[PDB]
Design a protein around this nucleic acid. Structure first.
Lengths: 87, 100, 120, 98, 84, 100, 99, 87, 100, 65
DNA sequence: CTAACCCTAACCCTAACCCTAACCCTAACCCTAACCCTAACCCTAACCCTAACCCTAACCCTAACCCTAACCCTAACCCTA
DNA sequence: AGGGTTAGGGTTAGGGTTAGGGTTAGGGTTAGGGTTAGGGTTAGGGTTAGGGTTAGGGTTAGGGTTAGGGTTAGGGTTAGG
């Protein structure tokens, strides 16, 4: 059966070519070596905050499933209104 | 333009032009799906994430990363430079008012 | 009849107008129905926040050899408390200055400046 | 003609009482009292607005203690939110008991 | 009688220098005063336009500190003390 | 022939400390009132402002200028410099999101 | 679903009619339709909140065309706000002339 | 397949009467209510500091099992030599 | 009706004497094993501890807690008090050199 | 660290005082060399809040109010 | 009248297996940027003091806020198409 | 059914006015030290590749979970004193 769970091979999930392609899409020609760790840390902090907000919303809604509507509500409460996914 | 060696700095411009005309996701879903589940474990266990929540999360994260990279690139050329550095991301985040 | 009229503040143990909070929640066009424990909860939260802020201001005034609370001491305590600064980030206190924070580069380390004549 | 001037509502007596409860030797100027009055009103309007948004999102036309506890945990940070939640729970427990 | 050209110059150079010293600036360039005056004029124009709109909506002809605080909070700058 | 002239730096530092350890205002009141009156003249004529209104306006303007000067000084320090520059002010306004 | 379920609300028909009026022989996508619906809902909620705040500040209880026009002039920029105000005044005049 | 409780004893076991039994061994008569959390915290940090050295000692011999000998060897470095169990 | 309730003090004293005149343990074994397993999970995965190892760990932890409680009680007695306090624990850890 | 301390103290040479200052400033260095005392070196001017003048209000009696 | 109760219909979330194939990791070579040193200028640091000017201390009064008195139209709730 | 509208007078209040002297800025002056120009050093990743870990569907099942509908009762509402 499934006798395993998730580990810390998760910060390393944000691979280096992915961050490089994101910087190239933004407009960066040369990317330093110590940028990947800081980017992963900032992304982890942001995801932690958004997931905490979504968990609070789900606990207030008396539910156990996080929905895209709750995610959009949390993102708008922070100050980032997202369109398309939801309504 | 021999296929053995290309001038460094020229292939990056073509890559930038090619990647700036597409709307596909750069971060992959399966590595990003486990990061969302691993963070939600500290708050409350036995949680079921919808198929549309991870997509919006990835889209928002990609947009935020693109904005931060653009801000860092704008801060890089200020000091007569062309490359980004970790000492620039801190200032770019502090001026925006996120780190406080 | 009616025996006696006890105050809601005395029955709740708080020092905030629960009746005024309920009236503001009913006339503020927030919802058609206003609960009973919600005004008490809000009054308790506001009282705790006010008590913490007043304690910080009194500590700052006692450290500044003063007896009264001034907006300068209020701003100093707000900027000192990390949670208060994160809560009230977009709030500017009138008649109050910032903290005397001098960077290390701005400090005077000319080191004879050099570049001039050979002082060897 | 008639007197009957409008009365402006303020929380000056409650702030002074909290001051005497915490530090019974200090004072509060008029500017500090006005700052504390604007801080209490701004937080009260932010929490009431967050509770109204939660009552409008979930199809329910009421505001109970859970809506305020959720608005407190979403607005206040960490230790302050937990302390405020504990104080509110103690208050509602003393109300439901006495 | 008031010279509309003698109002940007009202923000004197020593005033801007003292403001930069209070913020934490050691050396102030020469071309900073004009840009600071322009930015301050744009911000004051926006805030005064918001206050004028609020006063016209209130069917009044006097701009009040309450309306100024309301406009400042609508823009994203909550000010305490002056008002309530 | 020695008035003991101060080297450029100590006077600026002590002035910064003296202005930081105070709560009084810096800009005058009557010129600011004339300025806001001239600005309000471009919208509705025959307007009467308020003393508390112009005082709050001056306070908010002084706070915004202090924040902008702090951001510019931080950008200059990051750029291996000690003086502010219009390019630094422009970059600060571009990162903060005021450019429009 | 169709098992005594509930029906949501949207503005797809109005958006499609506006698109057909401003430009014939064009098309649209579901993502664009959802984005337009979210934008319309966000602007609607913002203008409604601004009008409610203005009515509460004016010590009144009715949000009318004047409050809506003030909220529009405060939210929208310059020429867009002017054109929106002109269109709203024309619509109000048409409603007053014929109902 | 896997335990539904992934808390893995979040600093549990150190209950109120358990601390109320160790403090009375020393001579504490009145035990404050704000002492249980600090006791759990200091116990957690001590166990962390000891387990770090234990894992560092066990990882040297390419071994995946922690024995009592490595535990007492790591405890000797901290300044607390235990007799009997190790040997 | 009567149960002859003991005044606060004699029960604590007799419990102190009974627990001092014994050699058995106080903390349980399975919760401590789960705790040390959770702590070891943060370093190397798939770890197998030992019964004697966790027993020695529990014994050393109990001895350290007893010493800390003795130091805290001594500090409280010196401070004209009879109950322990977190400030007393902090001062004991500061003097002993354990810091944080 | 010693050179940074000397440059901050308007000095060119490294002295044991600057060495002790840098050691006490660096948390990892202080944790590594905890039982090491540097000769010809003082501690940091750390004054507690209770030792500062006022706050305690030394008026005591104050005949009046 | 709306929220706390119960049965329960159906949905949507998770568990698990495949088939490679776009993508990810390292190590192989090398070009040009980040960075330290240094030196030339001209820019703003530091007065400065006599003139600009502002806020101090009051008077007023006439345009403006709105208060409470009268009155009716606009807004809501009802039902039912 | 009462909130908003109208006319009416009170009533605070801000603009307009005086003068002056004490605070402070305006424009020109001496000169220090920081700035961006330069050239030399170094290693920092840019670019290619080929071994190969792992991801997007493709297509299943099961049983948690939201809540649709119905019942009912009690807390918020409204009113006056």
């Amino acid at each position: 059966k499934r006798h395993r769970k998730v580990l810390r091979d998760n910060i390393q999930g944000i691979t280096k070519p992915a961050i490089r392609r994101l910087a190239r899409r933004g407009g960066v020609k040369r990317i330093s070596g110590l940028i990947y760790e800081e980017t992963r840390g900032v992304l982890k902090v942001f995801l932690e905050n958004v997931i905490r907000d979504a968990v609070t919303y789900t606990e207030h809604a008396k539910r156990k499933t996080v929905t895209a509507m709750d995610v959009v509500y949390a993102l708008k409460r922070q100050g980032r209104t997202l369109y398309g996914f939801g309504g | 333009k021999k296929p053995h060696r290309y001038r460094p700095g020229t292939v990056a411009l073509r890559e930038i032009r090619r990647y700036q005309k597409s709307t596909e996701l750069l971060i992959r879903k399966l590595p990003f799906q486990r990061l969302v589940r691993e963070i939600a474990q500290d708050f409350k266990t036995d949680l079921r994430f919808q198929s549309s929540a991870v997509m919006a999360l990835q889209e928002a994260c990609e947009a935020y990363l693109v904005g931060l990279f653009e801000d860092t690139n704008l801060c890089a050329i200020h000091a007569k430079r062309v490359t980004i550095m970790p000492k620039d991301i801190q200032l770019a985040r502090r001026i925006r008012g996120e780190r406080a | 009849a009616r025996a006696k009229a006890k105050t809601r503040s005395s029955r709740a143990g708080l020092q905030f107008p629960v009746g005024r909070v309920h009236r503001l929640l009913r006339k503020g066009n927030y919802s058609e129905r206003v609960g009973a424990g919600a005004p008490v909860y809000l009054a308790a939260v506001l009282e705790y926040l006010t008590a913490e802020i007043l304690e910080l201001a009194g500590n700052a005034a006692r450290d500044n050899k003063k007896t009264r609370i001034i907006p300068r001491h209020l701003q100093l305590a707000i900027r000192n408390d990390e949670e208060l600064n994160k809560l009230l980030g977009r709030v500017t206190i009138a008649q109050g200055g910032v903290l005397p924070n001098i960077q290390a580069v701005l400090l005077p380390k000319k080191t004879e400046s050099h570049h001039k004549a050979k002082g060897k | 003609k008639k007197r009957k001037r409008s009365r402006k509502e303020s929380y000056s007596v409650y702030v002074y009482k909290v001051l005497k409860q915490v530090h019974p030797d200090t004072g509060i100027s008029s500017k500090a009292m006005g700052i504390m009055n604007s801080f209490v009103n701004d937080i009260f309007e932010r929490i009431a607005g967050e509770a109204s948004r939660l009552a409008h999102y979930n199809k329910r036309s009421t505001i109970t203690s859970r809506e305020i506890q959720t608005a407190v945990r979403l607005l206040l940070p960490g230790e302050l939110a937990k302390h405020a939640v504990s104080e509110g729970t103690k208050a509602v427990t003393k109300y439901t008991s006495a």
